[PDB]
Design an enzyme around this catalytic site. Structure first.
Site, short mmCIF file in Angstrom:
data_model
loop_
_atom_site.label_atom_id
_atom_site.label_comp_id
_atom_site.label_asym_id
_atom_site.label_seq_id
_atom_site.Cartn_x
_atom_site.Cartn_y
_atom_site.Cartn_z
N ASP A 118 42.44 20.71 -38.72
CA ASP A 118 41.39 20.37 -37.79
C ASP A 118 41.86 20.55 -36.37
O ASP A 118 42.90 20.03 -35.98
CB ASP A 118 40.95 18.92 -38.02
CG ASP A 118 39.65 18.59 -37.32
OD1 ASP A 118 38.63 19.26 -37.62
OD2 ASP A 118 39.64 17.67 -36.47
N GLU A 168 41.42 25.73 -38.18
CA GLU A 168 40.08 25.77 -37.62
C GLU A 168 40.13 26.39 -36.23
O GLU A 168 40.61 25.77 -35.28
CB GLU A 168 39.47 24.36 -37.57
CG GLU A 168 38.82 23.99 -36.25
CD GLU A 168 37.45 23.36 -36.41
OE1 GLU A 168 36.65 23.89 -37.20
OE2 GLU A 168 37.18 22.34 -35.74
N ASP A 206 29.97 21.04 -39.62
CA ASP A 206 29.84 21.12 -38.17
C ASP A 206 28.78 22.08 -37.62
O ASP A 206 28.77 22.37 -36.43
CB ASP A 206 31.19 21.48 -37.55
CG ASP A 206 32.18 20.34 -37.63
OD1 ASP A 206 31.77 19.17 -37.45
OD2 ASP A 206 33.38 20.62 -37.87
N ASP A 251 24.26 19.02 -36.87
CA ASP A 251 24.95 17.76 -37.16
C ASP A 251 24.27 16.54 -36.53
O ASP A 251 23.76 16.61 -35.42
CB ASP A 251 26.40 17.86 -36.66
CG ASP A 251 27.23 16.63 -37.00
OD1 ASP A 251 26.83 15.50 -36.63
OD2 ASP A 251 28.29 16.79 -37.64
#
Lengths: 588, 588
Positions: free
Chosen positions: B328, B357, B424, B468
């Site tokens: 992340d 990511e 996301d 989101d």
């Protein structure tokens, strides 16, 4: 506005961090295609009303090779994260170059549109030792510098005929020699010596290394060495040794053991033996330096080997406080090893200088995780191509110069090992056609160019040898046989540098013309400092113009002292045949 | 022959090693400026009569974005070292592009002229695990997949109104859920699950991580986890967990300790606290994820921290045999750490997949020393831009596709985590305007594109959420509420892939036209294998042509079986509104 020319990437020289708070973002575009180009930026987390917030700063042109321009953007992103794009305008045309593509306008709904510099981290910052930026290197080839306590090899006394010496044979030189003529260099002005391999090896060149932990008896012993260093640090000289890890000699213990054991040798994988029975018939059947059987390629991917050389790199840094490491054929070693190398040595003595021998583009090695710099051979190529061969022109030279220069992030350049020759290339003088007039210009260029230069021992006193091994003639210690006119020249330049910052660590700026193929004039700048350099690469008096800034008060000529006043927009500098001159504009 | 367009560099995607014996050297030139371009090469130690020896091989064009062309050269240099230049001819014009510059002829007196690839080393070879190249990922968001042994949080039962659920609150989901519907996926055909953070944390999203060593009670325990894995490996599914090392939660012990100690806290430098008195007033006074006070940025440059996360990365790989790690905000962590990360995990279980990511260009991270790949968001961008928003065209899409594709060395692409959405981003369906006709095309593209794709749990059964947190609605396990037509579609594509190599690991080749803005036809190839893909991104029946190779014997239509014979130079494929079709040409 030709888009094929425009280009950027969030990596390497096009985008990197200068310090722990500033980023350098350079944009390449066509020749004179763009009259402007602003830097659109903002934090990737700066939004408002569901729109990514951002402001725009202007970017200035900082050079241009033959086809491109290169712009630059100095930005200190708040919080250390930033997303960016470029806004280049060429008249009425307005483009918005982004990582995603072009846009007549700046997209604001998403950040994913623009290029991105995630986070500025000190640890990933490329940082070479700040001291190498001020020194001037002098590279000696032990086996041909100065003979000391004759504990040398039984062969050829000092020099031979005016021409024909250097027969790939020892002349007696040793470490004691350097310790003796240390004041010669200390007078010249060199602040560091880079010396060819001196580890036990049966050769005039210790590249056939036989024992990385033992100094070739012929050169001396730990004591002799311990002195050379002590004495040097005393004088302000840093000693840089040569690391030959890419290969070894036919005498290296492990390899010698692959002959009295073979496949049973616990050192079988210490090398690259494709086929056994070790046959170097038509040529080695294992990897070698070039095709040199007496030079087997080591296996740095091997835990033991890797642990060996790495214990070697730290030994001489612990036991002798040396300040550097030259890496022979460094580009032929797996990147993995070098990051381990850098970690060891920079952990021991962070100030050690890691220099790698790479005669080509070494971006892959100058990312801040491996080397501190390389033996900048591309620049030398351009210098010799201009002043020596006089191949290219003043504008082409300026271009090829602005080129290689931009292909790296500043800090990388600021620590470049800018040499012009070495034990592996024809002598500077023979390359100039014996015309010491040109050699004087070359030393003027180098010692005037930013980075960490290095002089090949013989070259400072009008020595002459040519292509290897002729380039390793015994040093000329005869006050009558050595050009003091040239020596004096180099000595005043080294000092001109030592006192004028812009010369050693500043930004250049060429001023060449397409018609005037032989007039090179550039300005070294650094804050308020400015040191102009006019040069007439011709063999007939010339009138090269030089623009003076209105803000300038004085215009002191260096090497002569003639200090006058600007009061003009230009100053037609008149120079003799291969003349030249330096100026240090004031401010008032 | 516009030289501003031509370009090469001996680093990254333009030049790299495919295997321990082959190199890939790509040359970029203007649109259709060059009709040819040969690769001039030879060993940097191959000479004869004082002239560097070399031969020349032809390079083929392999694509071209909107402006460039990109050529490729597959060469296996003998002895593993090679120096090269390019010979591009556009009619009568003949240039010899080299690292030094252009030449109407190939320089032979020196090697220093050309670009150079020092030595091909296996250790520096970019090698991602070969298994990820064949799998199809499915990413579940635990807190909204399937409820198991109700050891959940006291709040909202399952789903709400047809619309309006997902209120940034827990619904009960847990690890037991996945262990139950494991056969659902095993039927669908997914060969690996990537699941959002599941480590102890007070949130529906465990990014506010409070304990990297303890699974949030709510999801279960080491046992529950030990089962999910065992069971998965049983089914042929690899479990990939989420590593949140860039920051922590307001509940993380160390940070909690920087409140009952402050400057005395032995964990002061575990973070980035610019000013003390820890004031997150207008916004945190220390570095945070975005500006999230309850998300302090960790200091990976710190020996302890670095040692902590690194013990975490190996814990779950030792104690649970997980096969991967999602990083992340991986791009916001100092490159230094990642090479240490890769060294630990690849040392423990070499097959672990390191995914990072990065929604932008990640070349700096895909050099073979850090990540194995990233969450390929740029591709998704292009896919959604074509099939969903229908922004760009078939030719522009093909270009932007051939673009991002070439900006990386093959092997990197061959392991790309090609997703189209995730926790996301807006749901695939809502993004298609509810037109499941398009969603079916998108799944056709992805599951037809080389790399290691991933499906966002809900998206396979016509789920709908949008931006989101609406994209994390509870899974629709109702056979009546879930589009089986779409589910069936995805299931036959996943199998079409599992059996047709070219689809998962082969080379694409677009065939778009400037006039036909809505006709996309490309061919996945891999040796003898060929799987054509026609697509009519329109809302009206169309006649898209498709060329058949004379060597082709059959032309079996997939998903239907209709197998006919070539016998033609072209085959005008007729498709319904948003129709499409696959073909697997034979050979005879």
């Amino acid at each position: 506005m030709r888009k094929e020319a425009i280009h950027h990437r969030s990596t390497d020289n096009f985008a990197y961090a200068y310090d722990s708070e500033t980023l350098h973002l350079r944009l390449q575009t066509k020749k004179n295609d763009v009259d402007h180009v602003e830097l659109l930026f903002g934090d990737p987390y700066e939004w408002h009303d569901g729109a990514w917030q951002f402001q725009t700063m202007p970017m200035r042109k900082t050079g241009s090779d033959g086809l491109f321009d290169y712009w630059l953007a100095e930005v200190k992103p708040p919080y250390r994260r930033l997303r960016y794009g470029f806004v280049l305008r060429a008249g009425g045309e307005k483009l918005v170059y982004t990582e995603k593509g072009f846009y007549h306008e700046a997209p604001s709904d998403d950040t994913a549109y623009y290029f991105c510099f995630p986070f500025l981290h000190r640890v990933d910052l490329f940082q070479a030792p700040d001291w190498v930026k001020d020194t001037v290197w002098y590279q000696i080839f032990p086996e041909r510098f100065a003979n000391g306590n004759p504990a040398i090899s039984p062969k050829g006394a000092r020099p031979w005929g005016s021409e024909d010496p250097t027969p790939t044979s020892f002349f007696g030189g040793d470490l004691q020699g350097i310790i003796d003529h240390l004041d010669y260099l200390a007078d010249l002005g060199i602040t560091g010596i880079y010396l060819t391999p001196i580890f036990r090896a049966p050769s005039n060149h210790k590249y056939d290394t036989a024992d990385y932990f033992e100094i070739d008896p012929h050169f001396g012993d730990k004591e002799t060495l311990k002195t050379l260093v002590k004495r040097c640090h005393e004088k302000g000289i840093r000693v840089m040794l040569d690391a030959v890890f890419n290969h070894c000699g036919y005498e290296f213990a492990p390899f010698q053991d692959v002959l009295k054991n073979g496949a049973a040798s616990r050192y079988k994988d210490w090398f690259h033996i494709r086929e056994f029975p070790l046959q170097t018939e038509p040529r080695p059947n294992y990897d070698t330096f070039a095709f040199v059987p007496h030079m087997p390629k080591l296996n740095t991917a091997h835990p033991e080997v890797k642990r060996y050389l790495l214990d070697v790199a730290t030994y001489w840094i612990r036991e002798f406080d040396i300040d550097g490491w030259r890496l022979d054929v460094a580009n032929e070693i797996d990147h993995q090893f070098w990051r381990e190398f850098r970690q060891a040595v920079k952990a021991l003595k962070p100030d050690v200088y890691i220099l790698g021998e790479i005669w080509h583009d070494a971006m892959p090695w100058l990312r801040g995780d491996q080397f501190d710099a390389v033996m900048n051979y591309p620049l030398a190529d351009a210098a010799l191509r201009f002043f020596a061969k006089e191949d290219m022109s003043a504008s082409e030279f300026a271009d090829r110069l602005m080129h290689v220069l931009h292909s790296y992030p500043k800090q990388v350049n600021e620590a470049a090992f800018n040499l012009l020759g070495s034990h592996d290339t024809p002598r500077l003088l023979t390359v100039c056609g014996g015309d010491v007039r040109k050699v004087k210009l070359l030393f003027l260029f180098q010692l005037t160019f930013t980075g960490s230069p290095c002089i090949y021992y013989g070259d400072e006193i009008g020595m002459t040898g040519g292509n290897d091994p002729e380039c390793r003639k015994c040093m000329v210690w005869d006050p009558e046989k050595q050009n003091k006119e040239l020596y004096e020249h180099v000595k005043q330049l080294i000092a001109l540098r030592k006192q004028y910052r812009a010369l050693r660590r500043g930004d250049v700026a060429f001023l060449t013309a397409d018609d005037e193929v032989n007039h090179l004039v550039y300005a070294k700048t650094d804050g308020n400092e400015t040191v102009m350099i006019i040069i007439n690469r011709s063999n007939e008096a010339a009138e090269i113009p030089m623009p003076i800034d209105a803000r300038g008060k004085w215009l002191v000529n260096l090497l002569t002292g003639e200090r006058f006043a600007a009061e003009a927009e230009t100053l037609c500098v008149s120079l003799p045949p291969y003349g030249f001159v330096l100026y240090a504009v004031e401010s008032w």
